[PDB]
Amino acid sequence: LTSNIPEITPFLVFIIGNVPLPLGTVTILCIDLGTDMVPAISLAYEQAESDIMKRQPRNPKTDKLVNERLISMAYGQIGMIQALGGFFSYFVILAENGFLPMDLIGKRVRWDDRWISDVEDSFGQQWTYEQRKIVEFTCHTSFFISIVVVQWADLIICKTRRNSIFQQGMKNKILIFGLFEETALAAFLSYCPGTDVALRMYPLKPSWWFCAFPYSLIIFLYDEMRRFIIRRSPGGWVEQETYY
Amino acid sequence: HFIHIITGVAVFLGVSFFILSLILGYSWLEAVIFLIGIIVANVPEGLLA
Amino acid sequence: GWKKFLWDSEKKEFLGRTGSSWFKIFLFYLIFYGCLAGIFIGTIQVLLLTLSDFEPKYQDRVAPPGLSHAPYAIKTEISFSISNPKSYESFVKSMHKLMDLYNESSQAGNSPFEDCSDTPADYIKRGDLDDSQGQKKACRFSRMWLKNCSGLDDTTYGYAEGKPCVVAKLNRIIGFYPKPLKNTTDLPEELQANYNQYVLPLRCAAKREEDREKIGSIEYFGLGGYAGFPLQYYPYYGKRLQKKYLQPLLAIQFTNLTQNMELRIECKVYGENIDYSEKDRFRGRFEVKIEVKS
Amino acid sequence: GWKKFLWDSEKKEFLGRTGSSWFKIFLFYLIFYGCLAGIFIGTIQVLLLTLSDFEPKYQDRVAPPGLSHAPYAIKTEISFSISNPKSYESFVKSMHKLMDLYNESSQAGNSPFEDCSDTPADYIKRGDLDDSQGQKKACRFSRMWLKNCSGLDDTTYGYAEGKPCVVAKLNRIIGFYPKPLKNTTDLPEELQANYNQYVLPLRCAAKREEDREKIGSIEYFGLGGYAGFPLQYYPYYGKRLQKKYLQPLLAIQFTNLTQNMELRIECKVYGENIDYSEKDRFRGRFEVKIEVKS
Amino acid sequence: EGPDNDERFTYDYYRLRVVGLIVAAVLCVIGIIILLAGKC
Amino acid sequence: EGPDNDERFTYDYYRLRVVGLIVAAVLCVIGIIILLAGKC
Ligand SMILES: *[C@@H]1O[C@H](CO[C@@H]2O[C@@H](C)[C@@H](O)[C@@H](O)[C@@H]2O)[C@@H](O[C@@H]2O[C@H](CO)[C@@H](O[C@@H]3O[C@H](CO[C@H]4O[C@H](CO)[C@@H](O)[C@H](O)[C@@H]4O)[C@@H](O)[C@H](O[C@H]4O[C@H](CO)[C@@H](O)[C@H](O)[C@@H]4O)[C@@H]3O)[C@H](O)[C@H]2NC(C)=O)[C@H](O)[C@H]1NC(C)=O
Ligand SMILES: CCCCCCCC/C=C\CCCCCCCC(=O)OC[C@H](COP(=O)(O)OCC[N+](C)(C)C)OC(=O)CCCCCCC/C=C\CCCCCCCC
Ligand SMILES: CCCCCCCC/C=C\CCCCCCCC(=O)OC[C@H](COP(=O)(O)OCC[N+](C)(C)C)OC(=O)CCCCCCC/C=C\CCCCCCCC
Ligand SMILES: CCCCCCCC/C=C\CCCCCCCC(=O)OC[C@H](COP(=O)(O)OCC[N+](C)(C)C)OC(=O)CCCCCCC/C=C\CCCCCCCC
Ligand SMILES: CCCCCCCC/C=C\CCCCCCCC(=O)OC[C@H](COP(=O)(O)OCC[N+](C)(C)C)OC(=O)CCCCCCC/C=C\CCCCCCCC
Ligand SMILES: CCCCCCCC/C=C\CCCCCCCC(=O)OC[C@H](COP(=O)(O)OCC[N+](C)(C)C)OC(=O)CCCCCCC/C=C\CCCCCCCC
Ligand SMILES: CCCCCCCC/C=C\CCCCCCCC(=O)OC[C@H](COP(=O)(O)OCC[N+](C)(C)C)OC(=O)CCCCCCC/C=C\CCCCCCCC
Ligand SMILES: CCCCCCCC/C=C\CCCCCCCC(=O)OC[C@H](COP(=O)(O)OCC[N+](C)(C)C)OC(=O)CCCCCCC/C=C\CCCCCCCC
Ligand SMILES: CCCCCCCC/C=C\CCCCCCCC(=O)OC[C@H](COP(=O)(O)OCC[N+](C)(C)C)OC(=O)CCCCCCC/C=C\CCCCCCCC
Ligand SMILES: *[C@@H]1O[C@H](CO)[C@@H](O[C@@H]2O[C@H](CO)[C@@H](O)[C@H](O)[C@H]2NC(C)=O)[C@H](O)[C@H]1NC(C)=O
Ligand SMILES: *[C@@H]1O[C@H](CO)[C@@H](O[C@@H]2O[C@H](CO)[C@@H](O)[C@H](O)[C@H]2NC(C)=O)[C@H](O)[C@H]1NC(C)=O
Ligand SMILES: CC(C)CCC[C@@H](C)[C@H]1CC[C@H]2[C@@H]3CC=C4C[C@@H](O)CC[C@]4(C)[C@H]3CC[C@]12C
Ligand SMILES: CC(C)CCC[C@@H](C)[C@H]1CC[C@H]2[C@@H]3CC=C4C[C@@H](O)CC[C@]4(C)[C@H]3CC[C@]12C
Ligand code: NA
């Protein structure tokens, strides 16, 4: 439920701020049914944190499976950071090719037209229609890769609901395999010849792959300090506000 | 219960971007098409499987 | 249910929480989103510091250059009736919009428009891409050079009596030097005559072998009377270093056009650093569908 | 030079810069140091969240326990004249400071001092190291138990007529259970008699073989009359969980002490989780130099 | 930087794709190794 | 946690020193390798 935000926010900005389209349909589908599945199917193999045979039976009317405390995390805090990282990589790709952030607001009408073969950028160059479309597609590819990068820290902060990573431990071999495969698939979809023809995903330059790293570390640190006050402070604000 | 929750935020975000698409200028065909896109976009294909 | 979860009067709750909870949550999200905004802004400022103002870091997506045209035809079709005047208005409005930038009133004084050779010439380098010698100077391009398509004599530009014009233009690229083909034994048929090294040739033809006969006399107008672009207007130094810069233009009159029939005309530029693409139908060449139905 | 670099009146400079520079630099350092302070404070708050309030994370540097004493002797020497009263004042003030904490007035009511066996007994576990059952309860230790060194009869405690006392004390350690040596054939000579499993024995002697003769009768006073510490006062739960806790004490009277001669007396505790160190002369044992010069 | 500055408009995407594939492959292998390490 | 909780006051400094020395040694070697790599 965390990756839904960095998947819907781009269209909301496409209609509101009038910027070119950041994320494509063929990228959302490749994430939802590809990358996300293996790491999430692996989360099931996780061991206990405390003695489960000690607590009383759950209540059916009050304790649920999906409560608002979860929505506040996935839709409210982690997914938001994921969206910021995706938009960051986006603006970087468009700024390095000639389209600065000040000139992107208000361009969709001419950025989409199929018959305007002269679109001036921030430096005065004239871009044909297919040329600007290739850049938009390369932005979809890097946005999808940014999503994978942030899913790393999301799978790690989702491994433990309360306990710390330095306590439980990374003894789950399936989760490790999920991260490795999740990265190999993204690299394969971008670098294989004939992918920019079949699926419309162009190769990335090596400096772009590092635009989502800081957001991922931040997600890890935020959730780590989150899962700390809950331990030291039982019954406080952090508990009745963020404990799934 | 989970399905209920999900469908709630999807129809809330759609009704909100419809009123917004009317305060900015878009025609009714675009505002209606936008609503349908936002709702369907809030559905997770693999969580049930 | 319906009523209680909305407002109960014992715990003084609205929607589920009390007065102090909505405040704790609102304050938390205000601080959280504020930090998020500040971080995004800082990471965007370092980006403004990374790039240069006089040159795009990557110039591989725009090469070779395209070939655009006025008028603005949708689906690459120019269809209009010689009787109904409200048929070619959308075209003339565009043609006029393009030529309206070459008015002599705009090009006046020593700066930043200097007088250049009335006959095609070689390149001109105004230094490097720096701010040392201020705003560079660009060559002047007069309207009158285009003979029968200038909007100065026949405002309509030809659409009035079944003789249309098409002003072709080469896409502006920073630091791009046009290189024409040499006089060696290998050269297209057309290009042999009037080889002026300093001119980049543009030549239109028919897409299909049949249409050849149905297309009449393609009369090109340009600098010096040649069917090309003079190399002296290059290279382009970019907006920041060369504001008030005019790119050459080439007029094409499709005289003697068969009536009531769709004609597919493909125009193509030739040169070394010019390459076409089977996917982009505007890279180096362009297609136009003309049908003067009357 | 001397005058100009101090104040010139053309550029309106003081010490070298103008008015606006000192402000730019002062503002920069204020913001910089402010960020530095905020970062250091945040990294210290996460540290306050890491550790526990009822238990030190690392307890390897304090084991086994030491053996301190009152009085407070500097260089481990107790030298005083039996005539001049202003000679043993610094000692009595300390002895008194230590015993002043075992006043009966302080130990009153059911909490948190419960009455314990008047004779040595076994350990007592008041649960785990949690806050569930509130403040734990500690056993009462009466002053009078120490017979001739209590400051209740002879305030001076003995220093008045050439018979001093030494109140020995075992260093308080959280969760430390004292373990005495068992009755097996291997045990020191001294310890054989009066083996009360529940008592940790303390026995003093002479450092050198010669001094033996010059040392008189070592008379130990303690709980039950034994020369040790009762196991019932353990373990210690820490200040937070056991405020108002009293540790056992053992009085030692060095009767029949030779006059005008430095005597080296070494006291030593015995037990399983007790180990001495050749570097720390206070780990388990202690040394005292006594010289009652009169 | 002169007429023959043609390099300013070229990028070796071929070599980049080759390396990116070598890397993807290695990561895939390592993953398999970790997955099967213990069932042998 | 009971009388025989003796482990709560012990630390294996020996093993720690052994490992810390193995590591220091490795780092020293690697350094030499980098330094002389090129003069052969
Ligand atoms: C670039 O130059 C353009 C042309 O400049 C003219 O020719 C050059 C060589 C010089 O001699 C120069 O001095 C000339 O002006 C210039 O555009 C021109 O702008 C004027 C001023 O608005 C226009 O005149 C007005 O024309 C209309 C009717 O226009 C008919 O024809 C045009 C095509 O030419 C069609 O597009 C229209 O739909 C019409 O069919 C008149 O109604 C209007 O009346 C006004 O003036 C009269 C007095 O004369 C008053 O009584 C009225 O109340 C009105 O105020 C004007 O006479 C002229 O049409 C227009 N030319 C073209 C081809 O559109 C352009 O602005 C210059 N641009 C720059 C950036 O310098
Ligand atoms: C271009 C811009 C991009 C925009 C992107 C938007 C992305 C959207 C992100 C998130 C969507 C949020 C939508 C709301 C989600 C609410 C979750 C919810 O409805 O979950 C259902 C819970 C049920 O939970 P349960 O089963 O445990 O109950 C058990 C009860 N038992 C046991 C007592 C019976 O019901 C409840 O929580 C009660 C319902 C509470 C509803 C609160 C509504 C608040 C919504 C908006 C507020 C905005 C105000 C802004 C102004 C602030 C002031 C400055
Ligand atoms: C600027 C860049 C920002 C990037 C942000 C995203 C980062 C997310 C990716 C990686 C985060 C790594 C976090 C490291 C955590 C280490 C924790 C650890 O070490 O805690 C030690 C545990 C505890 O042990 P214990 O005391 O319980 O044992 C008891 C044994 N008894 C029972 C026998 C006594 O020990 C154990 O877990 C057992 C040993 C497990 C060893 C795990 C080693 C593998 C670690 C990471 C794999 C790499 C993933 C890379 C993904 C990229 C793909 C391209
Ligand atoms: C762990 C459990 C995993 C479970 C997941 C199930 C695994 C699924 C495995 C395989 C399904 C993938 C099917 C992909 C089909 C791509 C079809 C394609 O590329 O056809 C190319 C067409 C050609 O068109 P044309 O003839 O007009 O060209 C004329 C060009 N001229 C004229 C210029 C020469 O182009 C087009 O249709 C253009 C439109 C492109 C449409 C792309 C649709 C792809 C949708 C989802 C992809 C998700 C798969 C991700 C892989 C996951 C691996 C685990
Ligand atoms: C615990 C979890 C362990 C996980 C381990 C996963 C294994 C990682 C596997 C492979 C990573 C190494 C990749 C090396 C590839 C170099 C290839 C190369 O030749 O690449 C050159 C590019 C420069 O490209 P250009 O655009 O300038 O030229 C383009 C010029 N044209 C296009 C015209 C040709 O450079 C590049 O791609 C730069 C490549 C990225 C640099 C690696 C950075 C490593 C980051 C953090 C590691 C720090 C470890 C610290 C150790 C602590 C020990 C306690
Ligand atoms: C690119 C993405 C960047 C993202 C960076 C995000 C950084 C922002 C992180 C935190 C800022 C939010 C701070 C909000 C403080 C005001 C909240 C407040 O008003 O709270 C009131 C309560 C005190 O009320 P009570 O509980 O006594 O009353 C009991 C009442 N009843 C019964 C309801 C429980 O406050 C409490 O409990 C104390 C709880 C305070 C919350 C601690 C959360 C700390 C989380 C993260 C900080 C770590 C940042 C690491 C970043 C590294 C960057 C490289
Ligand atoms: C238990 C132990 C397990 C161990 C398993 C080990 C598995 C093997 C490991 C690695 C194999 C590495 C293979 C490297 C392939 C290099 C292919 C390559 O360098 O091709 C480059 C050229 C295309 O260049 P271009 O001129 O068109 O560039 C565009 C130029 N412009 C656009 C400017 C005009 O290729 C061509 O022409 C022809 C390309 C023909 C198709 C090659 C297929 C390669 C695709 C995928 C294979 C990799 C899978 C690795 C595992 C992934 C798991 C998910
Ligand atoms: C580019 C520059 C390259 C530079 C490379 C330099 C080479 C580095 C050489 C060696 C480093 C590895 C050291 C591993 C030693 C493990 C030994 C071990 O058994 O240690 C256990 C301790 C846990 O101690 P305790 O107190 O819990 O138990 C005490 C229990 N008693 C005392 C009772 C016994 O654990 C520990 O010391 C934890 C040891 C530290 C964990 C390593 C963290 C690595 C950090 C960043 C690297 C990330 C790379 C990501 C890859 C990107 C690829 C592109
Ligand atoms: C071109 C290629 C170049 C290649 C060069 C390779 C060089 C060789 C590489 C590595 C050699 C590794 C040697 C490992 C030595 C292990 C020694 C060790 O584990 O000893 C531990 C014990 C002491 O334990 P304890 O019970 O007292 O602990 C205290 C217990 N409490 C305090 C609680 C009572 O040792 C003892 O008893 C006896 C100790 C006897 C003295 C051993 C000397 C080791 C010191 C330095 C040698 C390392 C230099 C490496 C390079 C550095 C370059 C600057
Ligand atoms: C323009 O095209 C016309 C045909 O539409 C050419 O004139 C024709 O010439 C043939 C002889 O070859 C005569 O039989 C026809 O009667 C002519 N028709 C007309 C309408 O004149 C004409 O030669 C062409 N002119 C140019 C310059 O290409
Ligand atoms: C205390 O020490 C004194 C010696 O200072 C002991 O008394 C001496 O005993 C010897 C016989 O062994 C006599 O010759 C001396 O005259 C005695 N001197 C004095 C001052 O009495 C005495 O026995 C010791 N008492 C104890 C309890 O140890
Ligand atoms: C850790 C968090 C809370 C720090 C967030 C720092 C914020 C407040 C900082 C980070 C980068 C900063 C921006 C950096 C550059 C500029 C350009 C200048 O012409 C106006 C101020 C402006 C726009 C700054 C405003 C304050 C800013 C956004
Ligand atoms: C990147 C920089 C500028 C961020 C610096 C953040 C500073 C202002 C933050 C970081 C950690 C914060 C502290 C965290 C915990 C506490 C304890 C609380 O009982 C009083 C506030 C106090 C003392 C906070 C004051 C503000 C603080 C010091
Ligand atoms: Na989803």
Say which CATH number the domain at D32 has.
Answer: 1.20.5.170
Query: Which amino acid residue places its CA nearest to atom 28 of ligand 12?
Result: C38
Instruction: Look at residue C58 and tell me if it is in a domain.
Output: yes
* Touch C-A: 3+ C-beta pairs under 8 A: yes
Chain A: list its partners (3+ Cβ pairs within 8 Å).
B, C, D, E
Nearest CA owner, ligand 10 atom 21: C256
- Same domain? For D44 and D59 the reply is no
Q: H-type helices in chain C, by residue range?
A: 19-50, 89-99, 211-214, 238-241
d(CA D17, CA D11): 9
* Gyration radius of chain F over CA positions: 20
C175 and E5 within 8 Å at the Cβ level: the answer is yes
Q: Are the CB atoms for D257 and D292 separated by under 8 Å? A: yes
Query: Could you tell me how far CA B22 lies from the centroid of its own chain?
Result: 15
Q: Are residues A37 and B46, on separate chains, in Cβ contact within 8 Å?
A: yes
How many angstroms separate the CA atoms of A204 and A97, rounded?
13
Q: Decide whether any atom of ligand 2 lies within 6 Å of the A66 Cβ.
A: no
Residues A175 and A44 sit within 8 Å (Cβ to Cβ): no
Q: Phi, psi at residue F22, to the nearest 5°?
A: -55, -45
* Domain-embedded: residue C37: yes
- Confirm or deny that B30 is annotated as ligand binding: no
Residue D286 lies in a domain: yes
Together in a domain, C195 and C243: yes
Convert C257-271 to b/e letters by CB count within 10 Å (16 or more is b). beeeeebbbbbbbbb
- Tokens representing residue A47 in the block: 């061991």
How close is the Cα of A199 to the center of ligand 4, in Å?
6
> Based on the domain organization, do D231 and D165 belong to the same domain?
yes
Interface of A with B (CB under 8 A): 1, 4, 7-8, 11-12, 15-16, 28-29, 32-33, 36-37, 64-66, 71, 75
Of the candidates C153, C178, C152, C156, which has an alpha carbon nearest to the alpha carbon of residue C165? C156
Name every residue whose Cβ is closer than 8 Å to that of residue E30 and which is 6 or more positions away in sequence.
Answer: A180
Residue A175 in contact with residue A43, Cβ under 8 Å?
Answer: yes
How far apart, in whole angstroms, are the C-alpha atoms of residue E8 and residue E1?
9
Which of D46, D48, D57 to mutate: most A Cβ within 10 Å? D46
Contact present, A16 and B20 (Cβ < 8 Å): yes
Q: Is residue D8 domain-resident? A: no
Q: Are residues D105 and D135 in the same domain?
A: yes
How far is it, in rounded angstroms, from Cα B2 to Cα C48? Answer: 44
Resolution in A: 3.4
Neighbour tally for C204: CB within 10 Å: 19
The domain tally of chain D equals 2
Q: Kindly state whether residues D180 and D104 are assigned to the same domain.
A: yes
Q: Which two tokens stand for residue C113?
A: 């428009």
Neighbours of A51 (CB within 10 A): 7
Same domain, D82 and D209: yes
CA distance D122 to A157: 48
Using the mean position of ligand 7's atoms as its centre, give its distance from the Cα of residue D87 in Å. 95
Assess whether chains D and C touch, using the rule of 3 or more C-beta pairs within 8 angstroms.
no
Solved by what technique? cryo-EM
Element (H, E) at D47: helix D19-50
User: Which among A81, A125, A139, A217 is the top mutation candidate for probing chain C, defined by the most C β-carbons within 10 Å of its own β-carbon?
Assistant: A125
- CB-nearest to E9 from C59, C128, C179 is C59
Task: Provide the strand spans (E) within chain D.
Answer: 7-8, 13-14, 67-70, 77-80, 113-114, 138-139, 165-170, 199-206, 217-221, 228-230, 250-255, 263-269, 285-292
Do residues A23 and A143 lie in contact, with contact meaning Cβ atoms separated by under 8 Å?
yes
What is the residue-wise DSSP string for A105-124?
TT-HHHHH-SS---EE-TTS
Cis peptide before E3 (omega within 30 of 0): no
- The verdict on residue C116 lying in a domain is yes
Q: How far apart are CA A14 and CA F23, in angstroms?
A: 54
Query: From CA C168, how far away is CA A197, in angstroms rounded?
Result: 30
* Contacts for C182 with CB less than 8 Å, ≥ 6 apart: none
Could you tell me if C158 and C225 lie in one domain?
A: yes
- Ligand 3 centroid to Cα of residue B17, in Å, is 43
Name the strand (E) or helix (H) holding C70: strand C67-70
Query: Does chain E reach chain A with at least 3 CB pairs under 8 Å?
Result: yes
State yes or no: cis peptide before A20, omega within 30 of 0: no
Residue among C61, C66, C173 whose CB faces A97 most closely = C61
Touching subunits of C (3+ CB pairs, under 8 Å) are A, E
Q: Give me the phi and psi of A110, to 5 degrees please.
A: -90, -25
Total residues found in chain B within this entry: 49
A229 touches chain D (CB under 8 A): yes
DSSP bridge partners of D69 = D168
**Residues A28, A34, A35, A40: is their CA dihedral positive or negative?**
positive
Q: Please check whether residue D276 is in contact with residue D183, taking contact to mean a CB–CB distance below 8 angstroms.
A: no
Taking alpha carbons only, the member of C248, C251, C236, C232 closest to residue A120 is C236
Query: Which residues does chain B have within 8 Å of residue A16's beta carbon, measured at their own beta carbons?
Result: 20, 24
Radius of gyration (C-alpha) of chain A in whole angstroms:
21
Q: Which residue has the tokens 């949690």?
A: D130
Chain E nearest-CA distance from C62, in A, is 8
**What distance in angstroms lies between residue A29's CA and the mean position of ligand 7's atoms?**
24
Which residues of chain C neighbour A126 with C-beta distances below 8 Å?
62, 65-66, 68, 171-173
From the list D108, D113, D106, the residue with the least C-alpha distance to D138 is D113
Do D63 and D45 share a structural domain?
no
Decide if C8 is inside a domain.
Answer: no
Query: Which residues pair with residue D289 across a beta bridge?
Result: D77, D264
Q: Which domain holds residue D155?
A: 52-294
B contacts of A66 (beta carbons < 8 Å): 1-2, 5
- Identify the sign of the CA torsion A199, A205, A210, A212: negative
Q: What is the domain-level CATH number for residue C131?
A: 2.60.40.1660
CA nearest to D51 within chain A: A232
Of A21, A25, A185, A3, give the one whose Cα is nearest residue A85. Answer: A3
For residue F21, the CA-to-ligand 9 centroid distance in Å is 5
Q: How far is A71 from chain E (nearest CA, A)?
A: 32
Chain breaks in chain E (C to N over 2.5 A) after: none
Residues D200 and D84 in one domain: yes
C43 shares its domain with C148: no
Q: Is residue D210 part of a domain?
A: yes
Single-letter residue type at C24: K
Task: Look at the alpha carbons of C38, C44, C50, C55 in this order and tell me if their dihedral is positive or negative.
Answer: negative
D69/D23 same-domain check: no
Question: Which ligand lies nearest the alpha carbon of A177?
Answer: 3
A102 conformational bin, left if phi > 0, alpha if psi -120 to 50, beta if neither: alpha
* C3 lies in some domain: no
Same domain for D58 and D165: yes
> Is D130 within 8 Å of D54 (Cβ atoms)?
yes
- Closest partner CB to A118 (pick from C36, C171, C283): C171
Measured at the alpha carbon of residue D95, what is the angle toward residues D94 and D97, in degrees to the nearest 5? 60
